[PDB]
Scaffold this active site. Structure first.
Site: not given
Lengths: 499, 469, 100, 187, 50, 102
Positions: B157, B183-184
C-alpha cells in the site's frame, strides 16, 4: 535420596502471609468466572483461585470483576475464594531459559528443574517507538538458497511464512535454526541468535518429536521452546505468543540478536475467536472477532531491529500462517499480510510436484529484503527473481512460445529450478551458496544436462574446495567479489562445468 | 477543572467514570486520569446518566484500579499547530515523539472540528500530473482533489504512496501532511528517514512536511482519533496559513477498523459485517473536513486496506462516496507482475472528462478502455480454447492488448531497489503521444517483453534492439 | 428482576420522597440518556407522535420512539452542543417544511 | 455521595431509600419500621411468604399494600412511598431484597462491620472472644467502626481456619497447605 | 540409567501414597483439634502483628 | 434534484454544471450532504417530496430525482439501530420497505 531433598524443599514451604482480599466466585463456566469483591484489583492483574488455577481479570465492571481462567473449568468451583496475586500478568525472563522447554506460564515442562530467570516482565508491553527503530542491514542466513536470494531475511525483520497445512511447514523454520547453528556455535554475540520456537495449537506428541529432533541436532542449547499445545486451555493459548515475545524482548533488550518463530498464529486466531465468542462479544468478519486485527498487530510489532543508540537490538520474526487450501484472500491471512513485510507463500502444487522446499516465487516477496542481503549475494544474484519471472512467463504460454529465445530461458529456468531444491534438514552453507548462484546465473548450468544437476552441485562444490577453498574463504570474509574473485570464480566454474 | 470522578468500570478501553459532582463534562470533552504511567487521556462519548459518562480511552488501560481519581481536562483536546509543527512527529495526544522537545506553538486548536459549509467551497479543475503513466492515462490527479487508492497490502500500500510523495511532493511548495493511521512502525521509520534524507524535513534546516504517525501497535481507541488530530494540523495550514497543502492518509481502513472495534464496547448493536452503525456519519465527518474551500486547496490521498479485496464490504463502499478519483489496484494485476499494479478497468476520475483532458486524450483513453475490456471479455474463451481459435480480427486485438498490458509496466523510482530496475518519470504530454502510437500499432511489431517494464515509446524501441541483441 | 426506565436514581429518589413528575413533564422533560446523537428524555407525557422537540441546547429533534419510560428523540443536532439533564420544550408541531 | 455504594439488583431502590431518608435523618426510624413490617410479613404465611411472588393485579397489589399498612400505624412515610413504588413496579420479591440492602447501608451509617470466621466445626467461645478482641485491636477494625463477627460452620473446609472481615482475610487452613505439600511432592 | 531414573520416579509416587497415609492420620487424631488451637493462636499472633 | 449522502464538492459541481447550462433557474436542489445528521438524511427525501407536492398540487408538472435512496437506507439503518428496534435482514430495519414504499 532426591526424595529427601524434595522433602527438605517441602519443609522449606510454609507461609503465614495475610491475604489482602479474596473474592467469592458467583456464576462460573464459559472459562470466565464472575467474582464478587476484588475492589482494589488492578486491571489485567493475575488472580490465583483456591483451585490453584490463575486467571486474568478482563472486565472490571461496577460491583463485579470477571476473571478469565488461564486453566481448566473442572478445577475451578462455584463460590470458591479468589485471591489476588497482586501483580499484572508477567512471566519470568532471563538468560537461563536457553535450552529449557517451558509452557506459557513458564512452568518447566522439560522438567530440567525450576527455571533460571533473571526477572519477570509483563505479558503485554508496548512496542518501541519510531525513534527506537533502525533500518535492518544484517542478514539471517536460512541455508535455503531461495530463502536467501529470492527472499533475503535480516535481523529484527518482520516477515511472513504463509502456506498450506503440514507440508512440513515447520521444517522450513527448523532449517533456519539449523543453518544458524554454526553462526550460533560462533563466539560472536552479534552473530549469535537465540531462537525461540513457539508451538501453539500443536499436538503435544508432535511437539515432543520436535524437541527430540532439536536435541538430535543438539540445537536445543541455544534455543528456547515455549509450548501451548492443543490440550492447553484456550486462554492459555491466547496469551501464549504474547508471553513468548516477552522472553524474546529480554534478549532484544540485551541488544542481542535473536529470532522468534511463531507457529502458528492462525491457531492464535482460532483461540482468540473461541475466547471472544465465550466472552459473548459479537462475531466479526468471517466470524473472527473484530479485534483480531488488533491482536495480531500488537503481537507482531514487538519485534524490531532497535537503533544502535537504543541497544542495536534485534529480534527477527517469522510467523507461520496455515492457509485453508491457499487463497490468500481470507480475512485472517490478509490481516496478517498487512502487518508483515514480505511473505513466503508456499505452493501445494509444487510441493506435490516434488519441489521441496515448495517456495512459490509468484507469491513470495520480501518487502525489505535487499538491505539485509549480503553484497556477495547481491552480486551473484543477478536479478534471479526477474529471470525466474521470465521462466514463469515463458512456461505460462509454452503450452505459442517456440521461439529459441524462450526455449533458452526455459532450459535455464527448468534447470535453475533444480538448483533451488534442497533436501530438507540438510541446509547449505552461505559460502557454498555463492558459487551455485554464480553458476546458474552465468548460465554454466545449461552446460549440465537436467538429470545430472544434483550430481553437478555436490561435485562442483567438492571441486571448488579442493581446487581452491582460498576463494571461498575470501568471499567468506569479504562478502563481496572483486573483479578478480568474480573472474576466478567464473574461470573455476568453467573448469568444473567442462569437467 | 476540579470536576472529578472515579472509575466505575473498566470494560475494555471504554472506561466508565462516575462523576460525583453535579457538574458533568460535556460530550467530546476530555478527561485526564493521572497515572504512574504518566497520564491517560479519555474522551467523553456517552452520558449514561446517574452521573456516569462512558469514555473512550486514548491510551492503554493496563493496570487501572477501579475508583481511581478522574479529573476533567474539559473540551476536545487541543493539539498545537504552527510552523513549529513542521517537521515534527506528534503522538495522538500530541507529544513530539521525534524528540525535538516540547513543540512551542501560538495556537492550540481542538481536535474535533466542524466541516466547512456548503457556502465555503471552491471547485477545482486543475490537473496535477504525477508522471506515472497509468495514472496519467486513466485517472490523472488534480490540485485539491481527493484521490483514493483501494486494495490492501498485497499491492504494497505504502509503495504506491511513496512514489506519489517522491514525485508530487518534491514539486509541491506548500505544506504537506502525512498522517499514517495504523502504520507499521518500521515502514514509518523508513519514511521519516527518507524524508530527512530528501530534505523535506531537515531538523537543523527547514521542514515543509509535518508528520503525524499512529503505529498499529497503538490501542484501537488511539487509532480512532489519530485522523482527527491530523485534520486539525491540516486545517491550520488550509485556513490560518492559507498556503496550499498536500495530505496523505495511510490507512483509512484502519480508521474505520478502529471505530468498528470500539463500537461493540460502546454499546451499539453492530451493523452489517461488523461495522459501527455510525459508520456513515463518522466517514462523513472525516471526509468533509478535508475539502477545498475558498481559503485553501488541499489535495488528499486516502489508502483503503480493502479487507480481502471485498469492495462489497461496507467500509470500502462508503469511501467511494467521498472520492473524486480512485485507482483501485488489483492483486491479480500484481500477480501479472505489473508494478504499478493499478487495475485499468477499475480506475475512474471525474477528471477523465473530454473537456478536461481534451477530446484527443479522451478518444485515446476510450480506445484503451474498449480494447482492454474486449481482452478481459475474451479471457474465458482464451483459456478454454487457444487464441488461434479466435477470430482474425480478435487475435490482432488480443495481441495489441497483450502489448498494452505490458506497456503499462513502468519502472518505479521509489521501488527502484525492490524492482531492481532504474525508475522512470514520463510526462503527461509524452504519455498521450506514446499511447497514440501504440493504438495505431506503429511500433507494434516488436516483442511483447519489449513493452514490459519500460518507460516511454522511445524506450520500448531501444529495448527492442536490446532484446534483439 | 428486570431493568425499568424508572430505575434512574434521580427519578427513583424523587418517587421515594413522594415527589412526582408533577405534569410539567407533560410538555417538558429532562434528558437522562443521551449520546450517539440519540437522546431519551423522561417526561413529555403529552407529545404528538412524530413531533419536533426544541431541545434546550437549541437543537431540534424529531421523536420517533415513544415509550412509557423515555421518549426517544432523534437529534438533528451535534453531540458536543448537547448536554445531559437538559430540559426539552415541545415544538408542538409534527415535522414540517416551508413549501412554495 | 452517601456512604456505601451498593447499587444492587433493585438495590438502586435501596440506595434511593437510604439517601432520601438519610437527609430526612429518619433512617434508623425507617429501618426500624421497615423491619417491623418485614417481620410481620415473614409472620404472614399465606401471601407474602406464599404469595411473596406476584401473579396479582395492580389494583389487587395495591389492596395487598393497604392491608400491609393497616397492620402498622408506625410505618414512617418514606417506606410508605417505597411500598407504593414496589406496588407500582409490581415487585414484591425484591421486598426482602431491599430490606437486606437497606440494612447494609443502614449498618454502614451505624458503622458496624461484619466478618466471618469460617471453620469446619463451631469452636470455643474463648477463641471467639480472643479473636474478636484481636480484630478490634488490629487496624483492620477502625475506630468508630464496630465489629460483628460470626463464626460459621463450613464443614466443606475440613480442618484449617479462615478469618474474614472487611473483604480482607487471613486464611490459615489445612487444605491449602496440604495442597501445596502434595504439589511440591509431585515436583 | 533408564531404569534408575524410573525407579526414582516410582519412589516419588509411592511416597505420594505415604502422604495419603499421613492425611488420614492427621484427620483422625484430635491433633485435628489440638493443632487447630495452635493455628488459632498463630492467627491471633499474626493479626496482632497488623 | 435531491442529493442525499453526497459530498459538498459533488453538490458544488452539480450547481456549477446547472448554472453553466443555465437551468438552475428552473431547478430546486434539496440537499442533505454526507456530514449532515443521519436523522436529517432520513428526513430529507420525505420533505423533498413535500416540496414537489406543492408543484403537483398546484396542478403543475414537475420531476423529482432521488439520488441516492441507497444512502437513505443506510441512514435509516443507523437511526433504527440506535433506536434499538431489532434490525431487518442485511441490518437494514424490518420496516425499511414501508418507509421506501410510502
Amino acid at each position: 535420596e532426591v526424595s529427601s531433598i524434595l522433602e527438605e524443599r517441602i519443609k522449606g514451604v510454609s507461609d503465614e502471609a495475610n491475604l489482602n482480599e479474596t473474592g467469592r466466585v458467583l456464576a462460573v463456566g464459559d472459562g470466565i468466572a464472575r467474582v464478587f469483591g476484588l475492589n482494589n484489583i488492578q486491571a489485567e492483574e493475575l488472580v490465583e483461585f483456591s483451585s490453584g488455577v490463575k486467571g486474568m481479570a478482563l472486565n472490571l465492571e461496577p460491583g463485579q470483576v470477571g476473571i478469565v481462567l488461564f486453566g481448566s473449568d473442572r478445577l475451578v468451583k462455584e463460590g470458591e475464594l479468589v485471591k489476588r496475586t497482586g501483580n499484572i500478568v508477567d512471566v519470568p525472563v532471563g538468560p537461563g531459559l536457553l535450552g529449557r522447554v517451558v509452557d506459557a506460564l513458564g512452568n518447566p515442562i522439560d522438567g530440567k528443574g525450576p527455571i533460571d530467570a533473571a526477572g519477570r516482565s509483563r505479558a503485554q508491553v508496548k512496542a518501541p517507538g519510531i525513534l527506537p527503530r533502525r533500518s535492518v542491514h544484517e542478514p539471517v542466513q536460512t541455508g535455503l538458497k531461495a530463502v536467501d536470494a529470492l527472499v533475503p531475511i535480516g535481523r529484527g525483520q518482520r516477515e511472513l511464512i504463509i502456506g498450506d497445512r503440514q507440508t512440513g511447514k515447520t521444517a522450513v523454520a527448523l532449517d533456519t535454526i539449523l543453518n544458524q547453528k554454526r553462526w550460533n556455535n560462533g563466539s560472536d554475540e552479534s552473530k549469535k541468535l537465540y531462537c525461540v520456537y513457539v508451538a501453539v495449537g500443536q499436538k503435544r506428541s508432535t511437539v515432543a518429536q520436535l524437541v527430540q529432533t532439536l536435541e538430535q541436532h543438539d540445537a536445543m542449547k541455544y534455543s528456547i521452546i515455549v509450548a501451548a499445545t492443543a490440550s492447553e486451555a484456550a486462554p492459555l493459548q491466547y496469551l501464549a505468543p504474547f508471553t513468548a515475545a516477552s522472553i524474546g524482548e529480554w534478549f532484544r533488550d540485551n541488544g542481542k540478536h535473536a529470532l522468534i518463530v511463531y507457529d502458528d498464529l492462525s491457531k492464535q486466531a482460532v483461540a482468540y475467536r473461541q475466547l471472544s465468542l465465550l466472552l459473548r462479544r459479537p462475531p466479526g468478519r468471517e466470524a473472527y472477532p473484530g479485534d483480531v486485527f488488533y491482536l495480531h498487530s500488537r503481537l507482531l510489532e514487538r519485534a524490531a531491529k532497535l537503533s544502535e543508540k537504543e541497544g542495536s537490538g534485534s529480534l527477527t520474526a517469522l510467523p507461520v500462517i496455515e492457509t485453508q487450501g491457499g487463497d490468500v484472500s481470507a480475512y485472517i491471512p490478509t490481516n496478517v499480510i498487512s502487518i508483515t513485510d514480505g511473505q513466503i507463500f508456499l505452493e501445494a502444487e509444487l510441493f506435490y510436484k516434488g519441489i521441496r522446499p515448495a517456495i512459490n516465487v509468484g507469491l513470495s516477496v520480501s518487502r525489505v529484503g535487499s538491505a539485509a542481503q549480503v553484497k556477495a549475494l547481491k552480486q551473484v544474484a543477478g536479478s534471479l527473481k526477474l529471470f525466474l519471472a521470465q521462466y514463469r512467463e515463458v512456461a505460462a504460454f509454452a503450452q505459442s512460445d517456440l521461439d529459441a529465445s524462450t526455449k533458452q530461458t526455459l532450459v535455464r529456468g527448468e534447470r535453475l529450478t533444480q538448483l533451488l531444491k534442497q533436501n530438507q534438514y540438510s541446509p547449505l552453507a552461505t559460502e557454498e551458496q555463492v558459487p551455485l548462484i554464480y553458476a546458474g546465473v552465468n548460465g554454466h548450468l545449461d552446460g549440465i544436462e537436467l538429470s545430472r544437476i544434483g550430481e553437478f552441485e555436490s561435485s562442483f562444490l567438492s571441486y571448488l574446495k579442493s581446487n581452491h577453498n582460498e576463494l571461498l574463504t575470501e568471499i567468506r570474509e569479504k562478502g563481496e567479489l572483486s573483479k578478480e574473485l568474480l573472474a576466478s570464480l567464473k574461470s573455476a566454474t568453467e573448469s568444473f562445468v567442462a569437467t | 477543572t476540579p470536576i472529578t470522578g472515579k472509575v466505575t468500570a473498566v470494560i475494555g478501553a471504554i472506561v466508565d467514570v462516575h462523576f460525583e459532582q453535579s457538574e458533568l463534562p460535556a460530550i467530546l470533552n476530555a478527561l485526564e486520569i493521572k497515572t504512574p504511567q504518566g497520564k491517560l487521556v479519555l474522551e467523553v462519548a456517552q452520558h449514561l446518566g446517574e452521573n456516569t459518562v462512558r469514555t473512550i480511552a486514548m491510551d492503554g488501560t493496563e493496570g487501572l484500579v477501579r475508583g481511581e481519581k478522574v479529573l476533567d481536562t474539559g473540551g476536545p483536546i487541543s493539539v498545537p499547530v504552527g510552523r513549529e509543527t513542521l517537521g515534527r512527529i506528534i503522538n495522538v495526544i500530541g507529544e513530539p515523539i521525534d524528540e525535538r522537545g516540547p513543540i512551542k506553538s501560538k495556537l492550540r486548536k481542538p481536535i474535533h472540528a466542524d466541516p466547512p459549509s456548503f457556502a465555503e467551497q471552491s471547485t477545482s479543475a486543475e490537473i496535477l500530473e504525477t508522471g506515472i503513466k497509468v495514472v496519467d492515462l486513466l485517472a490523472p490527479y488534480a490540485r485539491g482533489g481527493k484521490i483514493g487508492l483501494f486494495g490492501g497490502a498485497g499491492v504494497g500500500k505504502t509503495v504506491f504512496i511513496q512514489e506519489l510523495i517522491n514525485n508530487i511532493a518534491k514539486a509541491h511548495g506548500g505544506f504537506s501532511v502525512f498522517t499514517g493511521v495504523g502504520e507499521r512502525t518500521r515502514e514509518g521509520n523508513d519514511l521519516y528517514r527518507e524524508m530527512k534524507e530528501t530534505g523535506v524535513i531537515n531538523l537543523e534546516g527547514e521542514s515543509k512536511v509535518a508528520l503525524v504517525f499512529g503505529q498499529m501497535n497503538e490501542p484501537p481507541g488511539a487509532r480512532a482519533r489519530v485522523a482527527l488530530t491530523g485534520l486539525t494540523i491540516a486545517e491550520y495550514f488550509r485556513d490560518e496559513e492559507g498556503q496550499d497543502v498536500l495530505l496523505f492518509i495511510d490507512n483509512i481502513f484502519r480508521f474505520t477498523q478502529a471505530g468498528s472495534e470500539v463500537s461493540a464496547l460502546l454499546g451499539r448493536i453492530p451493523s452489517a459485517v461488523g461495522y459501527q452503525p455510525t459508520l456513515a456519519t463518522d466517514m462523513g465527518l472525516l471526509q468533509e473536513r478535508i475539502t477545498t474551500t475558498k481559503k485553501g486547496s488541499v489535495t488528499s490521498v486516502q489508502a483503503v486496506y480493502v479487507p480481502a479485496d471485498d469492495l462489497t464490504d461496507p467500509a470500502p463502499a462508503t469511501t467511494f462516496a467521498h472520492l473524486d478519483a480512485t485507482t483501485v489496484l488489483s492483486r491479480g494485476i500484481s500477480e501479472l507482475g505489473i508494478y504499478p499494479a493499478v487495475d485499468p478497468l477499475d480506475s475512474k476520475s471525474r477528471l477523465l472528462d473530454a473537456a478536461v483532458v481534451g477530446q484527443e486524450h479522451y478518444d485515446v483513453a476510450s480506445k484503451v478502455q474498449e480494447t482492454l475490456q474486449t481482452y478481459k471479455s475474451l479471457q474465458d474463451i482464451i483459456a478454454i480454447l487457444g487464441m488461434d481459435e479466435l477470430s482474425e480480427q480478435d487475435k490482432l486485438t488480443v495481441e495489441r492488448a497483450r502489448k498494452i498490458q505490458r506497456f503499462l509496466s513502468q519502472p518505479f523510482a521509489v521501488a527502484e531497489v525492490f524492482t531492481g530496475i532504474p525508475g522512470k518519470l514520463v510526462r503527461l504530454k509524452d504519455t498521450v503521444a506514446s499511447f497514440k502510437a501504440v493504438l495505431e500499432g506503429k511500433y507494434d511489431n516488436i516483442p511483447e517483453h519489449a513493452f514490459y517494464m519500460v518507460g516511454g515509446i522511445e524506450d520500448v524501441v531501444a529495448k527492442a534492439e536490446k532484446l534483439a541483441a | 428482576t428486570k431493568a425499568q426506565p424508572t430505575e434512574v436514581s434521580s427519578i427513583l429518589e424523587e418517587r421515594i420522597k413522594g415527589v412526582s413528575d408533577e405534569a410539567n413533564l407533560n410538555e417538558t422533560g429532562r434528558v437522562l440518556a443521551v449520546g450517539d446523537g440519540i437522546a431519551r428524555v423522561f417526561g413529555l407525557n403529552n407529545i404528538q407522535a412524530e413531533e419536533l422537540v426544541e431541545f434546550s441546547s437549541g437543537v431540534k429533534g424529531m421523536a420517533l420512539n415513544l415509550e412509557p419510560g423515555q421518549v426517544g428523540i432523534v437529534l438533528f443536532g451535534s453531540d458536543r452542543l448537547v448536554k445531559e439533564g437538559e430540559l426539552v420544550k415541545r415544538t408542538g408541531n409534527i415535522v414540517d417544511v416551508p413549501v412554495g | 455521595p452517601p456512604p456505601v455504594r451498593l447499587f444492587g439488583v433493585e438495590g438502586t431502590y435501596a440506595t434511593a431509600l437510604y439517601q432520601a431518608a438519610a437527609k430526612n435523618s429518619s433512617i434508623d426510624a425507617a429501618f426500624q419500621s421497615l423491619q417491623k413490617v418485614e417481620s410481620t410479613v415473614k409472620k404472614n404465611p399465606k401471601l407474602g411468604h406464599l404469595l411473596l411472588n406476584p401473579a396479582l393485579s395492580l389494583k389487587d397489589r395495591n389492596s395487598v399494600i393497604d392491608a400491609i399498612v393497616e397492620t402498622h400505624k408506625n410505618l414512617d412515610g418514606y417506606v410508605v412511598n417505597l411500598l407504593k413504588v414496589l406496588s407500582e413496579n409490581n415487585r414484591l420479591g425484591c421486598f426482602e431484597k431491599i430490606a437486606s440492602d437497606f440494612g447494609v447501608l443502614n449498618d454502614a451509617h451505624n458503622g458496624l462491620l461484619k466478618g466471618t470466621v469460617t471453620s469446619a466445626e463451631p469452636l470455643d467461645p474463648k477463641s471467639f472472644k480472643r479473636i474478636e478482641k484481636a480484630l478490634s485491636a488490629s487496624k483492620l477494625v477502625g475506630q468508630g467502626k464496630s465489629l460483628k463477627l460470626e463464626n460459621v460452620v463450613k464443614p466443606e473446609i475440613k480442618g484449617g481456619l479462615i478469618v474474614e472481615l472487611g473483604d480482607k482475610t487471613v486464611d490459615l487452613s489445612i487444605s491449602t497447605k496440604i495442597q501445596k505439600l502434595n504439589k511440591v511432592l509431585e515436583d | 540409567v533408564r531404569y534408575e531414573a524410573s525407579l526414582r520416579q516410582l519412589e516419588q509416587r509411592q511416597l505420594a501414597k505415604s502422604v495419603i497415609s499421613r492425611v488420614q492420620s492427621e484427620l483422625g487424631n484430635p491433633k485435628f483439634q489440638e493443632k487447630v488451637l495452635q493455628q488459632s493462636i498463630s492467627e491471633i499472633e499474626q493479626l496482632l502483628s497488623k
